[PDB]
């Protein structure tokens, strides 16, 4: 589904936040 | 369901931004 | 509903998020 | 309902992260 | 609803970490 | 929709975590 | 869907905050 598909969305781009955290390092 | 599936995705990669504060 | 549960383990990851920054600047 | 109920703790858990940032300054 | 009063709660609870943040930084 | 509209409101507050990064360098 | 078309928005944020953050890291 198109939400489903969005918040998957959500989720990889809080894991690339978590890589510029950890670019700290 | 998949709504739920990846609402626990989102929670998952918010635990990773957790622990990579320490790492 | 599973929704709900997955809702509350998103605000427990926040909490631990709130929690590692506390103890990292504490630092 | 539940589902709102769950989205008020999200809401609380991101103050909570906020204040977590309000003691360090 | 409900459903939209939490979420703008969360809008919130956001904006209130992006002013923190502001501070925190400003104060260094 | 009401959900819709506070969902973009919710983006918006994470635009404005951005900035606050933004301006820090 | 206007809600779908919102959580993108949304991810769309997130991903604006990790490169702002990767920003602030490089600039220190």
């Not at 918040?7 to 690339?16: N, V």
């Amino acid at each position: 589904g198109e939400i489903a598909k969005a918040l998957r969305e959500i989720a990889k781009a809080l894991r690339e936040x978590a890589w510029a955290h950890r670019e700290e390092a």
